[PDB]
Structure formats: C-alpha cells, structure tokens
Swiss-Prot record, chain A:
Species this protein is from: Homo sapiens
Recorded GO MF terms: gamma-tubulin binding
Gene Ontology CC, one term: cytosol
Protein name: Gamma-tubulin complex component 2
Description of how the protein assembles with itself and partners: Component of the gamma-tubulin ring complex (gTuRC) consisting of TUBGCP2, TUBGCP3, TUBGCP4, TUBGCP5 and TUBGCP6 and gamma-tubulin TUBG1 or TUBG2. TUBGCP2, TUBGCP3, TUBGCP4, TUBGCP5 and TUBGCP6 assemble in a 5:5:2:1:1 stoichiometry; each is associated with a gamma-tubulin, thereby arranging 14 gamma-tubulins in a helical manner. Gamma-tubulin at the first position is blocked by TUBGCP3 at the last position, allowing 13 protafilaments to grow into a microtubule.
Residues of the full protein shown: 206 to 867 of 902
Keyword Cytoplasm: yes
From Swiss-Prot, chain B:
Family named by the database record: Belongs to the TUBGCP family.
Subunit structure: Component of the gamma-tubulin ring complex (gTuRC) consisting of TUBGCP2, TUBGCP3, TUBGCP4, TUBGCP5 and TUBGCP6 and gamma-tubulin TUBG1 or TUBG2. TUBGCP2, TUBGCP3, TUBGCP4, TUBGCP5 and TUBGCP6 assemble in a 5:5:2:1:1 stoichiometry; each is associated with a gamma-tubulin, thereby arranging 14 gamma-tubulins in a helical manner. Gamma-tubulin at the first position is blocked by TUBGCP3 at the last position, allowing 13 protafilaments to grow into a microtubule.
Function: Component of the gamma-tubulin ring complex (gTuRC) which mediates microtubule nucleation. The gTuRC regulates the minus-end nucleation of alpha-beta tubulin heterodimers that grow into microtubule protafilaments, a critical step in centrosome duplication and spindle formation.
GO terms for MF: gamma-tubulin binding; structural constituent of cytoskeleton; structural molecule activity
Keywords: Acetylation, Cytoplasm, Cytoskeleton, Microtubule, Phosphoprotein
One GO term of the biological process aspect: mitotic cell cycle
Principal place of residence: cytoplasm
Entry keyword Phosphoprotein: yes
Natural source organism: Homo sapiens (Human)
Gene Ontology, cellular component aspect: centriole; centrosome; cytoplasm; cytosol; gamma-tubulin complex; membrane; polar microtubule; spindle
Chain segments annotated as transmembrane: none
Localisation per UniProt entry: Cytoplasm, Cytoskeleton, Microtubule organizing center, Centrosome
Name by which UniProt lists this protein: Gamma-tubulin complex component 3
Domain of life per record: Eukaryota
Length: 539, 572
C-alpha cells in the first residue's frame, strides 16, 4: 500500500523492487505483463516517481528480449554462426548480472537513492540497446551463415564515430566469425569442405563447372571482392589431390593478403602438375602432327593407300577396313617416333562441311587431367579446321595426278595452271602465315602462364583466331569455287573442246567473286597479294 | 509549504519531471521570496528538455548520417556529467537551501545554455554541413565556451576526417548518405564533381580541390591505367599530392609512353617528317586524280604501308606505327584523303576526341599548302626540260617568257608561306609546349599545355572563326596556281606538235607552199595565247595585292606581311 506510505521512504521501496526487474525476475510493485515487453507500475504512486521509473525500465524490456535470443538461437537448426553470435552475446549478460549485484550490496547501507540509480545504469542502458537491435535485425530477415555476418559488418560501419558502440559491434563480429573462418582454412589450404549445415559460400555437388558452385546469398559482403579467388583456389586443389591462420580485423587487411599468398600457391602446384608430369606442350604437338596436317610423310602415304576405299559412298565402308590402314599408315611412315600416336581414331561425320570422302575426320581421345584443357567442346574445332585442309589437300593431289596422264586437246594446259596456282597459293597462306605463326605465339604464350584458367584462354584464344583468319567464318563461294576444280579433273580423266572453255568462263567468274569480297574489309588483305603477283586479275 | 519541499521538487525539475509543473515552469501558498528563486532555478530544466528532445528525436530516424551520430553521441558525454551533479545534489538533501543552490548550479546554467543553443543553430544540417555549423561557434572568444565547443568539434569532425583519409590513400569513397563533398556518378571529365554545399568551414575552398584531384588520381590509376599498389594537416595533403601525381606520370610514360606519342603525332599527322610525306605524295598521284566514286579505302593502305617501308619512317617504334592509318572523308581524290592516327585507351584522356577533331581541321590546311607546292616544283621542272628542246624557235620565246616570270612570281608567294608555316607556326608554338611539359606534372598541367597548343595553331593559321574573310581570300590564290598549270601545258603541247611536224616535214624529204600557210597561221595564233598570260597575270596580281590589305586587321600575322613584301616588290 504505497499510497498510505510516506514520500521520502517509499522511494527506497521502489529502488529495491526496480533492482530485481533489471535481472528478469518479477517484482512487488513494478510487475511485468504477458507479451516489446510492457510493464505496469501502480495506479497510486507519486507523479514525480513513475515518470522517473518509466525512464529506467527500457533497460528491463531491452533485457527481456536479449535473454530470449540467447535461450533460443543456440539450437542446432541455425548453423555455426548463430551459435557464436549467441555465445559472445552471453558473456555480456553475465557482466550485467554483476552490475546488478554490486548495486544490491551497495543498497544495503541505504547509499542507493532512486536518483542515484538513474546515473549508474547509464552504460548498461546503452549496451543493452545494441544487443536488443541486433537480436531484432537477425530475426527480421532470416539470417544464418554468411548473411548473419554481412549484417555484423554493416551495423559496425554505421557506428564509425561512436567509439562506445563500435568497440562492441567489433567484439561480436570478431567472435561470430571464427567458426565461419575455421572452414575457410579448410577450403583454401585443402580441398575438404565440412559445412554440416548448409551455410558456407561454396557447396559441392555430385564436367567440373557444376561440381562446386558459388552460392550468392552466403557471401559475407566483405569477401565480395575475392568471392572468385576463393572458389578458384580449392578447385585447383581437388584436381590434384584425387590424381596424386586467418583472423578478422577492421581497417586492416591481414586476411585479404593472406588469401592471395595461398591462391598463388594453389595454382602453382596445379599448373606445374600439367607441364612436367603428364605434359601438355609435348602433348599438343601430337595433335599438330595430324590435325593441323604438319607431318607430310604420313598423309602422302595414307591417302595413297585408302583412296579407292574412300571414294565408295557412305554406309558402304567398314571401319574395320580403314583403321587397319591407318595403323599401317603411321608405322610405315616417319611418324613412328611418336609416343601418343595410339590415340588416333576414325570418326565419320554424318554431315558434310556445311559422300564417303567428305565424311572422314580423325578423332582424339584423352585421359582425365588433360581433358580439362582439350575437351569435346574445344576438340571439334580442331576437327572443323582439319576437313577444310583435307579437302584442299585432296584436290591438288589429283590435279597433280592428271599432270602426268596428258603428258605423252592443247588449250587446257593454260587453265590447269590457273587452278593449280590458286590452291597451291592458298595452302601456303593457310599454313605458313595463318597456322604456323599463330601456333608459334601459343608455344611462347604458354611459357608465361600463371594459372589454368589462363591456359584455357591462350588455347581457345588460338582456335578462334585460326577459324577467323581462315575462310572458316558467309564465304560459301569458296565451296562452290572448289567444285569446278575437282570436276574439271573428272573431265580430263575420261580420256570436249567446247567444255574446257566452258569451265574457264565459269571458274574465272567465281574467282573474281572471291577477291571482290576479300578486299572489302577494314591478314585478310594480304591474301590478295598471294593470289595475284604478276599483276594478273587486275580487273 | 516548507522550503525543504521546494528543494525536493526542484531536484526533479532539473531533468524534466515535475508543486512545480510545466513554457516556463510555473509554480503554484508560499512567500514571494521563494517563488522568484524557484522560477529562476527551474529555468535550467527547460534547458535540459530542449537538449534532450534533439538527442532523442534524431536518435530515432536512421537517415541522419554518420556525422550526425558523432554529434548526437557527443551530446551524451556532456549529459552523464550533468547526471553526476544531480547525484551529488540529491545525497545532501537528506543541508542545502535555495540561496545555496544558486552557487552550486551557477556554472551548469552556462553549459546548458551553449548546448541548448548549439542544437538550434544546426537543425537541418546533416553530413559535413553540420560539422561546419558547429565550427561557427568557435569564433566567440569566451575562454569557457571556446574550450567547450572546440571539443565537440574534435568529435564531430572525426567521421569527416575518416572519409578524407580514405578517399586520399585508397580512393574508395563509400557513403550511402551523401555527406562527403566528393559526389560520384554511377572518367576524368565526369563522375567526380565537388559539392559546394558539404564543404566544412575549416577547409579552404582551394584545399577542397586538392583532395578531389588526389582521389581521382588514384581511382583513375586503378581502373583505366590497370595498375594497383592545423599545419600538419596541410602538409599531409601536399605530401599525398607530390607523390601520387609524380607516380601517375611515371606509369603513363613507361607503360604507355604518353610523350613518345606527342612527338610521333607531330611527325606524321602534322607533316613534321617531310621525308615520308614527300614519297607519299608521289605514290598517291596516280590514284587521287580519279573521282572519289572509284576510290575505296582498302586499296590505299597498301600504298601507305609501302611508303613507311621506303622512307626513313621504317626505323620507328612498332607500337605507334600500329595506329597510323588512313580515313576517307565524306569531288576528287585530293579532297577526301587524310590520315587519322586513332588513339584509344588511357592515352585517350589527353586527346579526348577533340584534339582528333582539331588535327584533321589542321591537316587539311597543311595538305593543301603541300600539293600547291609540289605542283609549282613540277612546273619549274618542266621549264628546265622545256627550253632544252624548243630553243630553236626565236618567235616563241617572246610569249614563253611571260610563262616563266609568272611562275617565279607565283612560287615566291608559296615558297615563302611554307616558311611562315615552319618557323612561326610549328617550330615556335611547339617550343612553348615542350617547355611546359618537361617542367609540368600532375597530368593536369599537361592537358592544359596541350590544349592551348591547339588554340594557337588554329589561330596562327587562318583557320579561326573570325578570320573567315582571310582564308576564303587565300583560296582564290590557291586556285590561280591550278589555272596556270592548265593554261601552261596547253601552250606547251601546242608548241611540241608544231615542232614535231616540222621535224618530220623535212627529215623524210631531205608541198613547200601548202605548209607556209600552216606555218604562217601558227605564228598568227601566238598573239592569241599572249593575251591569255597577259590577262591571267594582271588578275593574279589583283588578288595578291588585295590579299595583303586583309592582313592589316591577330599579331603574329604581321610576321607574314614581311615575308611576302620583302624588298617591297609590291606596295609600289
């Protein structure tokens, strides 16, 4: 009955009641109401007390909402960060159960008047007002893993000049990020990712662009700058393992530099793993010998053997017959000194270069670790610029064959020299000035490589150039231009005078269509100087 | 109503909690000697409300900024102490009286009168503009106030000096709320504009342009250049200036050779080579004579490439030769040909699409004044082989002579204007550029030295805007050189035909009357041609003596009037 009680003494009754509510246990007069907790004091109290009491209770309500975040967010269904954030937020509540202990002892001697209380709790009213704002901005938007570590890096930058609520939010972040940073030292220095609850930025799966994928939500927003070098680090560690300390600081990057000192070793072990063991540069030269048609003493002996059995139509030739000739073509030739020669397979394409002869092309099979560089996506390109060179090699192989048949009616001699001087002036440009210098760049461009995703750039950067400098990228006039050359060989092989001159007006017109389009551009211009040299075709 | 009761209530009114009730705290009996002092003492509570409402209303919204927090969180350290005083005063109430309170609370009636009047002077200011309105309370002189406010300034100006030490050494500004006076735009010309409104008062307007230039120097050094790494306060800005800028030039001269392009862009684009442009005018002669419709760019490149291989321009850096190409302006081939020298990348911030729109505006004038000279050395070459053939016809030298004098009078006007182009336009205006580059720095004394280098050449040459009447007057003189070259070979060839017939008319026989009429009429056509060169010359001199009058118009042109009027061949 505080109404029938004196004034100066009832104030000492409230300060002992108000000294419990700061702990959580209810009181005699200052009671709690069922649930943001709202209290009631009393109907009949002095006006100059309640208006002062209601100024302190915002430290009780801001405590009946933090101890409910500790008892709750410590479960196992929330991850290894909503745990540490709830432990480091529990050491503080202990330091608040002491600041109410020192007051319950200092009150025994009567030395604690209500006006004196309103001064002592001033720091405990500001600290409990930060923990009651993180415990409501972590449950507003459901945060677990990284997103509950992005929040503790922005709620720490907004207090960039307070210095009494930044030394706090820098104690929570420095403690709610050790478990997250303890799996990061397992993903950079090794390939293993434990992460029982799905919270890490990188998750694995069950040919390798789908195994490990960056998760966008769980990025701490202070590793956003290096969100790529993290994933690119461990992935290098797994393609070698299966075959054969970091701390948090603000305004200091003692971890940002630490990631690079490992990524720069994560790549140096893999790149060197591909050059010395299961070598790559001594492995690509086993492709240039066949696909780019560099070995001559092998093709002049293969087409000489497998010609009659190639002119037969498609779905008429038995692959057990071709492969028996391919094996015999390699060993008898000078390609016998090639360790990787046993990976050449015959592959008859269904479509032509948009039968029998126009449907022949080599196929190359490679093992796992090298299949990252040379794969089915970047091998059919080797198989696209091969047929374009096997076609041009076949025609002037028989055009040189009719050269002896006629040599023991006499106006086709000056026309044959017009087509021979065209294909034999395309081969020289297609080989010695498009594919010979461009490859020579790659060989040197692989000595200064730094990481695999760069070699994967110096390679596809070489195939898109060969397919661009050549006529492979449209310019279909070359296809129809080649038809009258090979067909003219058939006419001469049938041993009329009104047909030789018919091919002239047809082929010469097709040739002038080429140089008209080859000239109109912004090398693709030096090709004209290879076609005509003595000023011919000046029209 | 005792005196101890008022002291009980007053100790609450000092905070806002109300006998005394709530703008003065009207008290409602007692003697007049008490009400008067109570109303005077309570006026410290009304000062405590106004300072509390601000630190409570503005501590609610989250759009008050980062500086507005260090202020609203520095009005609290100056209130905990005011809560310590109320603690002590309450322990003694159990003796103190009104007339005793006045001396106790005489000082905190002043601190609660500066702070309660410091939050009204800065009401709507946020960001740096607030750190500039709590500095305008330091010019007060009162040693008690100037040593209080000069402490709140040391807290409010901490976030401001946090962006500054971030935008200077790292060049990464980040403020969701617009506080810093450097406002970005989602490179040199745009994206970084000073903010006239959020500059703190304690930072002079010139110092605010050394930070916006230091931050931009580092942000541009990272992205485009593709490279990665009070009085002590004034010394810090200059220390960061004389190091960052001096490093920006080193990376812009070793990794891109900005200087080696300026010299190479004078040799070719400004005809400063001479050896290369000479051979280039001999090879384009058979091509440009045709109309423009039959001209296609892909053919000329082979000719240009041939010249660079023949002349001395072959011994040259391969990089600068990769950019030297041709472009076709959109007549005759001598009206649409021009070189371009396209430049892209980090070096493109010095030329900025305007220096490439001025050089071509200049290159046309140097190309015309170069073909108008190689024509006049072709004519002067014809006459040295002309007189070596028809020196046996004494009836033709009378009119052939007027063909020589008109030439030697025309080649002077051109061969003299060439010197004014070399010495008084190129060699003189370029010297003031290479002198303000080997001593300049910070890449902003280079742009301003290269930009004015294109405002004098446009002015020293007649390509200005207000000198239009002068250039169109010069073109007429450029045209009279062509009309001579057309009226010369007509008179030249007509004498070689009559000479060739006279050779065969006597060599096969060694008739006589039927040719004397042909030879006789040929002598009669001579005075007809003489009336051409007599009226062509008399009109050529009428367009030059008019040209000189237009030069007396804006000062360097006077050095041209002396070049032409040497020995006073004109001006009577």
């Amino acid at each position: 009955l505080p109404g029938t009680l004196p004034l100066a003494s009832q104030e000492s009754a409230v300060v002992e009641d108000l000294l419990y509510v700061l702990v959580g246990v209810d009181g005699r007069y200052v009671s709690a109401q069922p649930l943001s907790r709202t209290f009631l004091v009393d109907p009949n109290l002095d006006l100059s007390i309640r208006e002062l009491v209601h100024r302190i209770l915002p430290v009780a309500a801001s405590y009946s909402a933090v101890t409910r975040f500790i008892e709750e967010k410590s479960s196992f269904e929330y991850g290894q960060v909503n745990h540490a954030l709830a432990a480091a937020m529990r050491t503080l509540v202990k330091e608040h159960l002491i600041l109410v202990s020192q007051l319950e002892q200092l009150h025994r001697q009567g030395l604690l008047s209500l006006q004196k209380l309103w001064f002592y709790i001033q720091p405990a009213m500001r600290t409990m007002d930060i923990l009651a704002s993180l415990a409501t901005s972590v449950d507003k938007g459901e945060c677990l893993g990284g997103s509950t570590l992005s929040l503790l890096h922005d709620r720490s930058f907004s207090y960039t000049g307070d210095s009494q609520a930044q030394e706090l939010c820098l104690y929570l972040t420095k403690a709610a990020s050790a478990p997250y940073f303890e799996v990061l030292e397992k993903w950079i220095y090794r390939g293993i990712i434990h992460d029982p609850y799905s919270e890490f930025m990188v998750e694995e799966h069950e040919y390798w662009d789908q195994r490990y994928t960056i998760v966008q939500q769980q990025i701490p927003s202070f590793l956003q700058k290096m969100a790529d070098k993290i994933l690119s680090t461990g992935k290098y560690l797994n393609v070698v393992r299966e075959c054969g300390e970091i701390i948090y600081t603000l305004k200091e990057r003692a971890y940002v530099e630490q990631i690079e000192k490992a990524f720069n070793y994560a790549s140096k072990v893999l790149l060197d793993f591909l050059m010395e063991e299961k070598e790559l540069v001594a492995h690509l030269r086993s492709i240039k010998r066949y696909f780019l048609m560099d070995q001559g003493d092998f093709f002049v002996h293969f087409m000489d053997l497998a010609e009659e059995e190639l002119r037969k139509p498609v779905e008429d030739i038995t692959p057990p017959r071709l492969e028996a000739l391919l094996e015999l073509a390699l060993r008898m030739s000078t390609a016998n000194t090639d360790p990787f020669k046993d990976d050449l397979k015959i592959d008859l394409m269904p479509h032509d270069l948009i039968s029998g002869l126009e449907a022949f092309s080599f196929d190359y099979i490679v093992k796992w670790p090298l299949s990252l560089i040379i794969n089915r996506k970047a091998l059919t390109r080797y198989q696209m610029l091969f047929r374009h060179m096997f076609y041009c090699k076949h025609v002037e192989r028989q055009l040189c064959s009719v050269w002896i048949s006629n040599k023991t009616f006499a106006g086709a001699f000056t026309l044959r020299q017009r087509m021979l001087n065209f294909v034999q002036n395309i081969q020289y440009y297609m080989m010695f000035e498009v594919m010979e210098p461009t490859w020579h760049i790659l060989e040197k461009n692989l000595k200064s490589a730094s990481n695999i995703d760069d070699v994967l750039g110096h390679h596809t950067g070489f195939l898109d150039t060969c397919l661009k400098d050549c006529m492979l990228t449209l310019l279909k006039v070359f296809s129809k231009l080649m038809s009258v050359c090979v067909m003219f060989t058939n006419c001469m092989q049938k041993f009329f005078e009104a047909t030789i001159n018919k091919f002239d007006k047809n082929f010469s017109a097709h040739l002038l269509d080429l140089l008209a389009r080859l000239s109109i551009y912004s090398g693709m211009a030096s090709v004209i100087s290879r076609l005509d040299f003595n000023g011919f075709y000046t029209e | 109503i005792t005196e101890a009761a008022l002291v009980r209530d007053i100790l609450y009114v000092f905070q806002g909690i109300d006998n005394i009730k709530m703008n003065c705290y009207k008290v409602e009996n007692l003697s007049r000697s008490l009400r008067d002092t109570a109303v005077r003492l309570s006026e410290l509570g009304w000062l405590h409300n106004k300072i509390r409402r601000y630190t409570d209303q503005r501590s609610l919204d989250r759009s008050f900024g980062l500086v507005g927090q260090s202020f609203c969180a520095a009005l609290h350290q100056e209130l905990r102490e005011y809560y310590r005083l109320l603690s002590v005063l309450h322990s003694q109430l159990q003796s103190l009286t009104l007339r005793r309170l006045l001396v106790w609370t005489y000082d905190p009636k002043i601190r609660l009168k500066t702070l309660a009047a410091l939050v009204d002077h800065c009401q709507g200011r946020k960001g740096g503009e607030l750190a500039s309105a709590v500095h305008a309370y330091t010019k007060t002189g009162d040693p008690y106030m100037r040593s209080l406010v000069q402490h709140i300034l040391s807290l409010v100006s901490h976030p401001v000096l946090s962006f500054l030490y971030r935008w200077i050494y790292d060049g990464e500004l980040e403020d969701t709320y617009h506080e810093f006076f450097v406002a970005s735009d989602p490179l040199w010309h745009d994206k970084y504009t000073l903010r006239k409104s959020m500059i703190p008062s304690f930072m002079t307007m010139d110092q605010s342009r050394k930070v916006l230039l230091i931050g931009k120097s580092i942000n541009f050094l990272h992205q485009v250049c593709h490279d990665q790494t009070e009085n002590a306060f004034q010394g810090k800005i200059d220390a960061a200036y004389f190091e960052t800028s001096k490093y920006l030039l080193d990376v812009l001269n070793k990794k891109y050779s900005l200087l080696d392009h300026m010299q190479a862009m004078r040799r070719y684009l400004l005809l400063g080579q001479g050896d290369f442009i000479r051979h280039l005018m001999d090879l384009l002669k058979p091509e440009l004579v045709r109309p423009a419709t039959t001209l296609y760019q892909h053919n000329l490149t082979g000719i240009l490439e041939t010249a660079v291989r023949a002349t001395n321009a072959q011994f040259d850096s391969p990089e600068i030769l990769r950019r030297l190409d041709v472009r076709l302006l959109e007549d005759t081939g001598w009206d649409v040909f021009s070189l371009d020298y396209h430049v892209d990348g980090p070096i493109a911030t010095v030329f900025t699409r305007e220096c490439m729109s001025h050089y071509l505006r200049v290159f046309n004038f140097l190309w015309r004044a170069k073909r108008m000279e190689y024509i006049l050395t072709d004519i002067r070459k014809g006459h040295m082989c002309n007189a070596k053939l028809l020196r046996n016809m004494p009836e033709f030298s009378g009119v052939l002579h007027q063909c020589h004098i008109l030439a030697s009078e025309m080649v002077h006007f051109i061969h003299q204007m060439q010197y004014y182009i070399t010495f008084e336009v190129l060699e003189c205006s370029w010297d003031e550029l290479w002198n303000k580059v080997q001593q300049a720095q910070d890449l902003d004394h280079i742009i301003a030295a290269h930009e004015v280098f294109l405002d004098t050449i446009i002015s020293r040459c007649l390509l200005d805007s207000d000198s239009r009447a002068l250039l169109n007057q010069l073109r007429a003189v450029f045209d009279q050189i062509i009309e001579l070259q057309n009226a010369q070979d007509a008179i030249y060839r007509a004498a070689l035909e009559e000479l060739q017939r006279r050779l065969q008319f006597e060599e096969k026989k060694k008739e006589e009357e039927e040719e004397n009429k042909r030879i006789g009429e040929f002598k009669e056509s001579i005075p007809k041609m003489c009336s051409q060169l007599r009226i062509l010359t008399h009109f050529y001199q009428g367009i030059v003596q008019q040209f000189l009058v237009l030069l007396t118009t804006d000062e360097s042109l006077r050095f041209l009037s002396f070049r032409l009027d040497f020995n006073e061949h004109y001006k009577a």
